[PDB]
Symmetry: C2
Subunit: 142 residues, 2 copies
C-alpha cells in the first residue's frame, strides 16, 4: 500500500525533531510532504482551513504547545487511485503526542483523516482533512 | 529503509486482530513475519528465550492478557546488511498496547529491540531480542 507508507515516512521525519529545530527545518519538513498549493482542514462543529504558507506553523505549534513526540496511527485506511490524485480515507485515525517531563502526559485525538496525494513520483499531500470525534488525555500511574 | 518497513507491515497485520481470531490466524501471522527456526528473547535481569513453536502463543498471550491493540514504535533504528542477515538495532524501542473498555488503560514498555531478518525476498525475522528498560501504565483523565 503506497499511501500509508508516506505516513510511516512522515512519522519518521517527526522523530528527528529536537527543541533546537529552526523554522527553516519545518519549511524543509513541509516541502518534503506537502504540495506548494496544499490545504489543511481541522474539523471539531467549528471547521478551520489553512493554506500552504501556515502548514509549517501548524506542526510547529503542536511542539511549542509542549509536545516532544507526534505520530499518526491509521487503522484500516482505504486507498483509491483517481486521474488527478490518490485518496487515503481512514475513519479510525489517531493523532498521538507525548508531552513535557514534568506533566509526562500523552494526548490521543481520535477522528476521520482524509488525504489526497499527488499521483506522481514525490507523492506529496494535496489535501489534509482531519474530522476530530473524541479527545483523550492519558496520565501515568506514577 | 527496508527493515523498519517490515515492522510497519507487522503493526498493520496486528490491526486485523478481532476477539474472534483463531489459533490458525496466529500461525498465519507468525509464518508471514518469522523464519521456521526463529528465536524470540525478552530481557527484564531475568532472560527468557522461546523457539519458533511458541512465538504464536507469545503474541496471542498479550491480547488474552486483555490488550485490544499492539504496535511497536522504533525511534532511530540502525540498519546494517551482513552476509547471512540484515540487522535492526533500536535503543529507543516502544511496545505499546491498548487494554479493555472497563479499565481503558494503555501500557508502554520501553527498551532496546534487536532484530536479525533473512537477507532474501520474504525478509522474515530470524532473531527477536527485546531488552526492557522501563514499564509505563497510562490511565485516562476520565
Amino acid at each position: 500500500n503506497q499511501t500509508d507508507y508516506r505516513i510511516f515516512e512522515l512519522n519518521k521525519r517527526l522523530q528527528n525533531w529536537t527543541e533546537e529545530c529552526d523554522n527553516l527545518w519545518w519549511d524543509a519538513f513541509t516541502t518534503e510532504f506537502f504540495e506548494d498549493d496544499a490545504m489543511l482542514t481541522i474539523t471539531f462543529p467549528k471547521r478551520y482551513t489553512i493554506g500552504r504558507t501556515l502548514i509549517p506553523r501548524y506542526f510547529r505549534s503542536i511542539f511549542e504547545g509542549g509536545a516532544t513526540e507526534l505520530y499518526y496511527v491509521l487503522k484500516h485506511p482505504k486507498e483509491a487511485f483517481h486521474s488527478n490524485f490518490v485518496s487515503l480515507d481512514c475513519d479510525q485515525g489517531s493523532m498521538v503526542t507525548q508531552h513535557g517531563k514534568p506533566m509526562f502526559t500523552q494526548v490521543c485525538v481520535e477522528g476521520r483523516l482524509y488525504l489526497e496525494f499527488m499521483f506522481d513520483d514525490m507523492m506529496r499531500i494535496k489535501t489534509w482533512h482531519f474530522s476530530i470525534r473524541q479527545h483523550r488525555e492519558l496520565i501515568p500511574r506514577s
